[PDB]
């Protein structure tokens, strides 16, 4: 096939700033700065407009499995914008039946200690991703609050903590105890 052209455009909020040297896109706004270098995506990232209204991803002469990438890069940089302008926050509630999950944050920003799991005397020190602040909340009885800017980072750490607390050689249809990502969110809201 080789479709001659496919395009996508993001309308950048003025309150942000974007620099580029080739595929490396760096986004600096209120909450900080992020980088991401898209090598082997092979597209044209262009920035147009007074007050840099719009960004344009263009894929030339692509095949089907290759036009697939354009909106992926759109969504990636979109979530980057969401982080830099708002910041991502994840919330975790730990289900338990007879062994109240005892989660504390051994060091301030990361290194979550988990213990009293199902009766296991096995402590865990789950190492949160760099650039991610963990914070056990208090308005909800059993609540982890993960915060950061790169949704990749916060969500990766999130699934890591969830998966690190699971049963072995047990029925997961009745035994359920453990932590889970519950309600995907941001820092501040419109």
């Amino acid at each position: 096939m080789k479709t001659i052209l496919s395009n996508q455009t993001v309308d950048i909020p003025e309150n942000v700033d974007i620099s580029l040297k080739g595929r490396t896109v760096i986004v600096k706004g209120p909450r900080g700065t992020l980088r991401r270098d898209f090598n082997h995506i092979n597209v044209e990232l262009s920035l147009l407009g007074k007050k840099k209204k719009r960004l344009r991803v263009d894929k030339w002469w692509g095949n089907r499995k290759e036009l697939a990438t354009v909106r992926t890069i759109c969504s990636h940089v979109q979530n980057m914008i969401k982080g830099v302008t708002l910041g991502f926050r994840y919330k975790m509630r730990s289900v338990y039946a007879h062994f109240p999950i005892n989660v504390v944050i051994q060091e301030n920003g990361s290194l979550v200690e988990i213990r009293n799991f199902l009766g296991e005397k096995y402590i865990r020190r789950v190492r949160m991703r760099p650039g991610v602040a963990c914070s056990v909340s208090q308005a909800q009885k059993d609540e982890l609050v993960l915060e950061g800017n790169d949704i990749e980072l916060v969500s990766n750490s999130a699934a890591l903590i969830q998966q690190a607390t699971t049963v072995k050689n047990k029925d997961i249809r009745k035994f359920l105890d453990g932590i889970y990502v519950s309600e995907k969110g941001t820092v501040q809201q419109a």
């Binding site: 509630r93 338990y96 029925d171 249809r173």
Partner: protein, 52 residues
């Protein structure tokens, strides 16, 4: 204790799944073709047995 909210959230991560009858792989309930390649991306599947 398994209060109703924690229950019907945990059973989202651990009960509602779709399984490839030839390769035994957990798939999200939307899935129609197994995401593996040793079963052969087959179409037939089954829902996860609901617990007693």
């Amino acid at each position: 204790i398994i209060e109703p909210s924690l229950r019907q959230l945990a059973q989202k991560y651990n009960c509602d799944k779709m399984i490839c009858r030839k390769c035994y792989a957990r798939l999200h309930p939307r899935a129609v073709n197994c995401r593996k390649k040793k079963c052969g991306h087959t179409n037939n599947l089954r829902p996860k047995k609901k617990v007693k």
